[PDB]
Short mmCIF file of N, CA and C and ligand atoms in Angstrom, two decimals:
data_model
loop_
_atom_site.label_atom_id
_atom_site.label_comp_id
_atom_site.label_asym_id
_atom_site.label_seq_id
_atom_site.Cartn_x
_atom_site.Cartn_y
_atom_site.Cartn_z
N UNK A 1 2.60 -3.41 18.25
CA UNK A 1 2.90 -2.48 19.37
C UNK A 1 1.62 -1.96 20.06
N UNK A 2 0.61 -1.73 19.01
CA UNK A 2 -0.47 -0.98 19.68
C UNK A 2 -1.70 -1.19 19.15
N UNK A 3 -3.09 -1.67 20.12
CA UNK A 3 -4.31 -1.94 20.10
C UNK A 3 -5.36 -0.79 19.12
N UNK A 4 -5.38 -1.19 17.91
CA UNK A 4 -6.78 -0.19 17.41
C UNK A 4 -8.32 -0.96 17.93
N UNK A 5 -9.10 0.28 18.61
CA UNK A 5 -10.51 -0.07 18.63
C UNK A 5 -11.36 -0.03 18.31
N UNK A 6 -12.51 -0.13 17.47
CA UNK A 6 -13.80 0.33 17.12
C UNK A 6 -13.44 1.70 17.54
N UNK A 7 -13.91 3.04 16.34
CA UNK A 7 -14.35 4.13 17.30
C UNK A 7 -15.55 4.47 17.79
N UNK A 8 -16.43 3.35 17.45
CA UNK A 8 -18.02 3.83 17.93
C UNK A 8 -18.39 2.75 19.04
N UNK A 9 -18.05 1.43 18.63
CA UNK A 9 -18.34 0.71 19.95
C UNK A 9 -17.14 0.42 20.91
N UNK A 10 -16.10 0.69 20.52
CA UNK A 10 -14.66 0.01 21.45
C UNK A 10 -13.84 -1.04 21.77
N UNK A 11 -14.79 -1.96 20.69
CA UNK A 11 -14.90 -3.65 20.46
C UNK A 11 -13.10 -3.61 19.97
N UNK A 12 -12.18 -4.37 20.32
CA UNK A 12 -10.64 -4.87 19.48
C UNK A 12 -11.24 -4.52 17.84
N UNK A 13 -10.02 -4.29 17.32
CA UNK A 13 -10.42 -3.89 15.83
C UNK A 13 -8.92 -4.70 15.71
N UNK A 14 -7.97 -4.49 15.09
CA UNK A 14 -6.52 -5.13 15.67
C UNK A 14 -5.49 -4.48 15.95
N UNK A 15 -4.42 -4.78 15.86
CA UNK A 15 -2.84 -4.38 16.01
C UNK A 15 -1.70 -3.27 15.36
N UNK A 16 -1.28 -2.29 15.58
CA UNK A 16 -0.84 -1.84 14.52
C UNK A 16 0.30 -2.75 13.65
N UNK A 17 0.68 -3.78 14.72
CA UNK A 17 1.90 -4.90 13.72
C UNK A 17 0.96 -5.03 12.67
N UNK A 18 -0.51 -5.65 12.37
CA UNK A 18 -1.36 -6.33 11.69
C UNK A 18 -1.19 -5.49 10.58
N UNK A 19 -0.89 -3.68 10.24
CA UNK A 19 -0.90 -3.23 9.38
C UNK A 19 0.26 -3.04 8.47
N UNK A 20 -0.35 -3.27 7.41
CA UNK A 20 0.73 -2.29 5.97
C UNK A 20 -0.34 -1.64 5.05
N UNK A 21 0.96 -0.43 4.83
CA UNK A 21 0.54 0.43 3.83
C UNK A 21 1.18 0.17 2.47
N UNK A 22 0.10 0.08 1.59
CA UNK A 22 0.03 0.28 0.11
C UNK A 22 0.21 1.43 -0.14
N UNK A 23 1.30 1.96 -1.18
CA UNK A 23 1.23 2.89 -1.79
C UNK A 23 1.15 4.31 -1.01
N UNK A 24 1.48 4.57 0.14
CA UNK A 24 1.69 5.53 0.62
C UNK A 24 0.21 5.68 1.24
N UNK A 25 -0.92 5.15 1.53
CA UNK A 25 -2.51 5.10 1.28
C UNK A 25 -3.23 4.48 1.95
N UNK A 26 -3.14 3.39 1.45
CA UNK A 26 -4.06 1.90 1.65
C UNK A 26 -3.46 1.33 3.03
N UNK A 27 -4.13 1.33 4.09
CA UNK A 27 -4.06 0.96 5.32
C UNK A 27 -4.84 -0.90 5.33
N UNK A 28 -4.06 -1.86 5.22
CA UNK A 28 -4.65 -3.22 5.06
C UNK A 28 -4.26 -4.03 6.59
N UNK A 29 -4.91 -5.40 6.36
CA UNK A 29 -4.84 -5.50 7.91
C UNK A 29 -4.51 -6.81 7.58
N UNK A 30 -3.49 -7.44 7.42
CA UNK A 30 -3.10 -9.04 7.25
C UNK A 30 -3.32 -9.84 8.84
N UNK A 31 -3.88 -11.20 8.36
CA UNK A 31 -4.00 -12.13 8.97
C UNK A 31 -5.42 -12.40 9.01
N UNK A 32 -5.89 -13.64 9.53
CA UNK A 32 -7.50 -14.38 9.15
C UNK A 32 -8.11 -14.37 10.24
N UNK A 33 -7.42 -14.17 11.70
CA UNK A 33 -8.49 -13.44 12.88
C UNK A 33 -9.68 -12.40 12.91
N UNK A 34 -8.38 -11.12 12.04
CA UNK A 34 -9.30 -9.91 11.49
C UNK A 34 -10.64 -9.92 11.04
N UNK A 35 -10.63 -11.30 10.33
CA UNK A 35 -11.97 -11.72 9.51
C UNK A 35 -13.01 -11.81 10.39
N UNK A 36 -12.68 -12.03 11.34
CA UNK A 36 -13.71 -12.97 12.37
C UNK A 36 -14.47 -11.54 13.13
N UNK A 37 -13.84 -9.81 12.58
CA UNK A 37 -14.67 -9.32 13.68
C UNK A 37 -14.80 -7.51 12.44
N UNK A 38 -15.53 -8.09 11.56
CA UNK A 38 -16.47 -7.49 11.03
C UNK A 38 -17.05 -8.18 9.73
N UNK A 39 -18.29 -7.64 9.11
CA UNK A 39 -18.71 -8.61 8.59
C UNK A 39 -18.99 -7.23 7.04
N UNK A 40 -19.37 -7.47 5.85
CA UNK A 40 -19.05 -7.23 4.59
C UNK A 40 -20.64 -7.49 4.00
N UNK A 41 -20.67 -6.32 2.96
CA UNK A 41 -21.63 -6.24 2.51
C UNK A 41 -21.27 -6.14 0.72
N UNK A 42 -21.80 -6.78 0.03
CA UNK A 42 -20.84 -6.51 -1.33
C UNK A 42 -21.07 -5.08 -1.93
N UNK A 43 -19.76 -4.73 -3.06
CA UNK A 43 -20.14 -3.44 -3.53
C UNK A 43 -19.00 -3.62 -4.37
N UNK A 44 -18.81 -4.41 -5.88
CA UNK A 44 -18.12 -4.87 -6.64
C UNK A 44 -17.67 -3.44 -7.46
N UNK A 45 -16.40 -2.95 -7.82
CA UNK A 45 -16.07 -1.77 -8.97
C UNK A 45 -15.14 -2.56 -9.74
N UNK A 46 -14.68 -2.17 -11.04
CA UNK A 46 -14.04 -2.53 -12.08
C UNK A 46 -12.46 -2.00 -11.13
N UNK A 47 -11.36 -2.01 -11.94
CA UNK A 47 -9.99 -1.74 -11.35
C UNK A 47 -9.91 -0.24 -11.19
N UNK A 48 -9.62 0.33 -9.82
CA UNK A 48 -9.15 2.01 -10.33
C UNK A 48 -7.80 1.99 -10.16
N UNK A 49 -7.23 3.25 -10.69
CA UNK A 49 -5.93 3.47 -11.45
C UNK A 49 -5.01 2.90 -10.14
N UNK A 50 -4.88 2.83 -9.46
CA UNK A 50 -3.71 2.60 -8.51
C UNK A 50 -3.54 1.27 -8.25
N UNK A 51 -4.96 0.15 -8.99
CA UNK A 51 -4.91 -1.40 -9.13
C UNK A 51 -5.67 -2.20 -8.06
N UNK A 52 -6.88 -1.06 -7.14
CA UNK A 52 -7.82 -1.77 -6.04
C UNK A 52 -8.65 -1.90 -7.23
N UNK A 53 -9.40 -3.33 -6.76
CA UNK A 53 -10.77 -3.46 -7.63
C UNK A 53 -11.76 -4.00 -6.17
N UNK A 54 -12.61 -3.19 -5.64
CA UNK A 54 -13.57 -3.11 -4.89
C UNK A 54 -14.40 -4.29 -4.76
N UNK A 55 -14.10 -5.05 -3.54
CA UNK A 55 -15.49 -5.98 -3.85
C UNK A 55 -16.21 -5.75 -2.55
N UNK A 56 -15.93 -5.03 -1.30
CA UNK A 56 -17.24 -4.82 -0.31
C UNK A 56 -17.06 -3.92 0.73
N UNK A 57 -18.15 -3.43 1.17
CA UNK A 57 -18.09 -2.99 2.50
C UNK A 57 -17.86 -2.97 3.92
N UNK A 58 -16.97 -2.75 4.55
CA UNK A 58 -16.90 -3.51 6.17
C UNK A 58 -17.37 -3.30 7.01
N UNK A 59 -18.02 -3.42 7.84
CA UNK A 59 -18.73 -3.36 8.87
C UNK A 59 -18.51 -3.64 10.74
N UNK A 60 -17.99 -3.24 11.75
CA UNK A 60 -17.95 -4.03 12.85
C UNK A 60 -19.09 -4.87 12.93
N UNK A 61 -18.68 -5.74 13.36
CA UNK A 61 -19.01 -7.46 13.76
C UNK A 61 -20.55 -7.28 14.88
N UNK A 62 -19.98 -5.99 15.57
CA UNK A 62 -20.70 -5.98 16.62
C UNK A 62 -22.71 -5.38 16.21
N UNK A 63 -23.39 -6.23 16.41
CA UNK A 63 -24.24 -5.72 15.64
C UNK A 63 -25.23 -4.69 15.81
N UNK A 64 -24.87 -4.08 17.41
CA UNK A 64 -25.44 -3.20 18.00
C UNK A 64 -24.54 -1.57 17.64
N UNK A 65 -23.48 -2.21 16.49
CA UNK A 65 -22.51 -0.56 16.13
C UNK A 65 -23.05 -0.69 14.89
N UNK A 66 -22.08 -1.86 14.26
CA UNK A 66 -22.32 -1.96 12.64
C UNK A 66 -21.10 -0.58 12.10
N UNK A 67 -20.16 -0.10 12.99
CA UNK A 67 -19.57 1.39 12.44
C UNK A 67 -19.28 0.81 11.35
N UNK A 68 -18.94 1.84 10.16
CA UNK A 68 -18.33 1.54 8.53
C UNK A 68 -16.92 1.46 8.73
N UNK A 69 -16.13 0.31 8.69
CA UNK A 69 -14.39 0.02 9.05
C UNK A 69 -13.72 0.33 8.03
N UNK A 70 -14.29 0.32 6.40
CA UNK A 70 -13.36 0.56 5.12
C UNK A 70 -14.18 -0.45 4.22
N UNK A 71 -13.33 -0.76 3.68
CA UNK A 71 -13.88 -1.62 2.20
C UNK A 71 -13.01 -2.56 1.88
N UNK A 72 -13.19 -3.99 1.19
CA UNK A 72 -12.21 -4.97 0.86
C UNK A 72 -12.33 -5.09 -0.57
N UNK A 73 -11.14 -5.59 -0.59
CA UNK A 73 -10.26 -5.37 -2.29
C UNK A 73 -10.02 -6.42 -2.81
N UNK A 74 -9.80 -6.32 -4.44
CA UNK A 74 -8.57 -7.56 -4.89
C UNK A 74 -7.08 -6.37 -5.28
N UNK A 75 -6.51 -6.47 -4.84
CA UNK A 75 -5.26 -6.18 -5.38
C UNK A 75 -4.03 -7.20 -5.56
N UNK A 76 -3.30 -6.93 -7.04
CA UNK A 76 -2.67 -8.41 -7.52
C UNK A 76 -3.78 -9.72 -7.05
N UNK A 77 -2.81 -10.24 -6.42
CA UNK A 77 -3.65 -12.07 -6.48
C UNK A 77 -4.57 -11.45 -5.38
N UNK A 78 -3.85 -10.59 -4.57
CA UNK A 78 -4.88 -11.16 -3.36
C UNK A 78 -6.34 -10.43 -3.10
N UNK A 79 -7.11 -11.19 -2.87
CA UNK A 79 -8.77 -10.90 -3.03
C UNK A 79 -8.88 -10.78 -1.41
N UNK A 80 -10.06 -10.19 -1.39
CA UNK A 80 -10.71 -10.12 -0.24
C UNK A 80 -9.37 -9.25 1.21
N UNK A 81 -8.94 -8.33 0.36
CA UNK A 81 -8.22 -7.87 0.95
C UNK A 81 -8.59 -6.15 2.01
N UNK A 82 -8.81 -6.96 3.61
CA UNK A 82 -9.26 -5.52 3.78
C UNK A 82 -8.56 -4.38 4.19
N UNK A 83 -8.97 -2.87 3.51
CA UNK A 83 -8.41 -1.94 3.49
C UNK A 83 -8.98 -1.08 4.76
N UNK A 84 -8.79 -0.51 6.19
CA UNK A 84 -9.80 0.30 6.92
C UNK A 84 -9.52 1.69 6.46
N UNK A 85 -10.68 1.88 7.20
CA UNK A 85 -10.84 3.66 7.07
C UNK A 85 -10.30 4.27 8.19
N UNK A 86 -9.18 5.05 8.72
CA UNK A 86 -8.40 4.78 9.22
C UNK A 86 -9.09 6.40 10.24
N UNK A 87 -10.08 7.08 9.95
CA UNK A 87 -10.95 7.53 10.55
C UNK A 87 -11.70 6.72 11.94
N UNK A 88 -12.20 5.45 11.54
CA UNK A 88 -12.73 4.73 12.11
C UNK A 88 -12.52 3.88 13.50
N UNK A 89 -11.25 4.80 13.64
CA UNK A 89 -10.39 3.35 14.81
C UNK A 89 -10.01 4.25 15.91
N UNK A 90 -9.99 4.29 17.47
CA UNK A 90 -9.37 4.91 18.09
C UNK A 90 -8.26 3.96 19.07
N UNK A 91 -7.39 4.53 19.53
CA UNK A 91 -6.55 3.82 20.18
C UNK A 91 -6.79 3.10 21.48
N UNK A 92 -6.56 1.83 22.10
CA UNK A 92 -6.83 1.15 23.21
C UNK A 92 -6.13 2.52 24.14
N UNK A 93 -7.18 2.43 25.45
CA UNK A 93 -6.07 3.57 26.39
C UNK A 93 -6.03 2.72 27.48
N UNK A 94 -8.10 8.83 25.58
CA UNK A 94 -8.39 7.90 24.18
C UNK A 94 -7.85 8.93 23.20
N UNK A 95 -6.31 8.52 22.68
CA UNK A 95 -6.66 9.45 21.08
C UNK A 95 -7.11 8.70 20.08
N UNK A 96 -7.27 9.13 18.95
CA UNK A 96 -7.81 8.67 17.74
C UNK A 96 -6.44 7.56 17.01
N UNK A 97 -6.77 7.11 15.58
CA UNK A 97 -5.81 6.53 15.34
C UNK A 97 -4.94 7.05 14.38
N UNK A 98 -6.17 8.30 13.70
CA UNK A 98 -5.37 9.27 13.35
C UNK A 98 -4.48 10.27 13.93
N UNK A 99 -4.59 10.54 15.04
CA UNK A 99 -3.85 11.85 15.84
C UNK A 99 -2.43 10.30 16.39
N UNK A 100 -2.78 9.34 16.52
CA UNK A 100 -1.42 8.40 16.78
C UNK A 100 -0.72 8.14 15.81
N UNK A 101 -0.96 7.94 14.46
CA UNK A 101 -0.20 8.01 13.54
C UNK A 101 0.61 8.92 13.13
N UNK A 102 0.24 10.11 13.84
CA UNK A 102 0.51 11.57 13.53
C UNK A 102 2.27 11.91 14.16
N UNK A 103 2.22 11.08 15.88
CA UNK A 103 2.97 11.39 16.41
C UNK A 103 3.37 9.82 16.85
N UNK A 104 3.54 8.52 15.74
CA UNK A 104 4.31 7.96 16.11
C UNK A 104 4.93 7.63 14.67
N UNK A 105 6.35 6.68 14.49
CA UNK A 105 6.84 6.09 13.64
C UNK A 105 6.08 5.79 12.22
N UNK A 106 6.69 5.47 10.90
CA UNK A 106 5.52 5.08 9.98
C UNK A 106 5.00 3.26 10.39
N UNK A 107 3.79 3.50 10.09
CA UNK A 107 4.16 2.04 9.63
C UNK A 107 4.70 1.09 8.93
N UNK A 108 4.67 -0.13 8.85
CA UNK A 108 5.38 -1.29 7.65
C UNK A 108 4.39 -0.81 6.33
N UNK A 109 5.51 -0.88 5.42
CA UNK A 109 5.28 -0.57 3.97
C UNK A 109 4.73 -2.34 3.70
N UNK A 110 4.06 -2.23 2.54
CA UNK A 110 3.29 -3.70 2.09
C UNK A 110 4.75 -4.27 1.35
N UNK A 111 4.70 -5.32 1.34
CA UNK A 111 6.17 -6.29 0.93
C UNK A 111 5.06 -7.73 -0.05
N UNK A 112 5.30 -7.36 -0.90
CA UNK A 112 4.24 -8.77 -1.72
C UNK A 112 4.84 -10.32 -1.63
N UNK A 113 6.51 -10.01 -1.02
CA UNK A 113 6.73 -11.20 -0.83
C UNK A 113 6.50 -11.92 0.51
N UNK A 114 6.39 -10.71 1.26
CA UNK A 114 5.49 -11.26 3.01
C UNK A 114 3.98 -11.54 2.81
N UNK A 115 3.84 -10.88 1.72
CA UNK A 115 2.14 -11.54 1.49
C UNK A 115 2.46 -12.45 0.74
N UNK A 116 3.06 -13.01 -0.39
CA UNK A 116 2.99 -14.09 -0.49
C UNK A 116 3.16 -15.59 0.29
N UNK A 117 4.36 -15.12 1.09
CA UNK A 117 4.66 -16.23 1.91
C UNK A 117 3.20 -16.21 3.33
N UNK A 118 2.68 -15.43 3.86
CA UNK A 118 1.43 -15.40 4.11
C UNK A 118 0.51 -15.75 3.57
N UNK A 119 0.25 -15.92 2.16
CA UNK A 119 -1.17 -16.16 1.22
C UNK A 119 -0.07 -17.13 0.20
N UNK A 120 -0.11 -17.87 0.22
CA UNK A 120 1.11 -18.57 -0.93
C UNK A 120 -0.22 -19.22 -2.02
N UNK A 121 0.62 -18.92 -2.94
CA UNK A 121 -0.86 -19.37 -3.89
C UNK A 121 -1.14 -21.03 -4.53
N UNK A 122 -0.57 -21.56 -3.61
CA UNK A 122 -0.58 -22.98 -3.56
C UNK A 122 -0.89 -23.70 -2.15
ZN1 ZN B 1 -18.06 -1.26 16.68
#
């Protein structure tokens, strides 16, 4: 439905379709475009209680921002899963993406069988 942007440079960040929420929380961004527009710095943690195990930092792509987008995960199978910081994003027009979440619908809850059939492990 609606365009998130960089909030520091303005660069496409993606879609709110692109998102599901984990656990009432975890703001993730499915699909392999996403990949293509920030780039990751590692920062590996053991599992914390809710079942993220940390493997990096995100970064916009753009290398004249570099803003901090969130961090990517393994949760269950799927690795390299990124989570944003949902601070970080303002809406294509400017509110934030927090003050739009505020006053629109929830988003899609995470479904492991739409990620599977998305990430099939074969
Ligand atoms: Zn940026």
């Amino acid at each position: 439905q609606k365009n998130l942007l960089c909030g520091k440079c303005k660069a496409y960040a993606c879609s709110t379709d692109d998102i599901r929420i984990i656990k009432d929380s975890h703001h993730i961004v499915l699909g392999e475009a996403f990949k293509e527009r920030y780039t990751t710095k590692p920062h590996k943690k053991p599992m914390q209680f809710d079942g993220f195990e940390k493997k990096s930092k995100m970064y916009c792509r753009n290398n004249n921002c570099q803003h901090d987008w969130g961090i990517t995960v393994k949760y269950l199978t799927f690795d390299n899963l990124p989570v944003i910081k949902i601070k970080s994003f303002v809406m294509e027009s400017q509110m934030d993406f927090q003050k739009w979440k505020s006053i629109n619908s929830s988003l899609k809850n995470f479904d492991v069988e739409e990620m599977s059939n998305l990430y099939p492990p074969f």
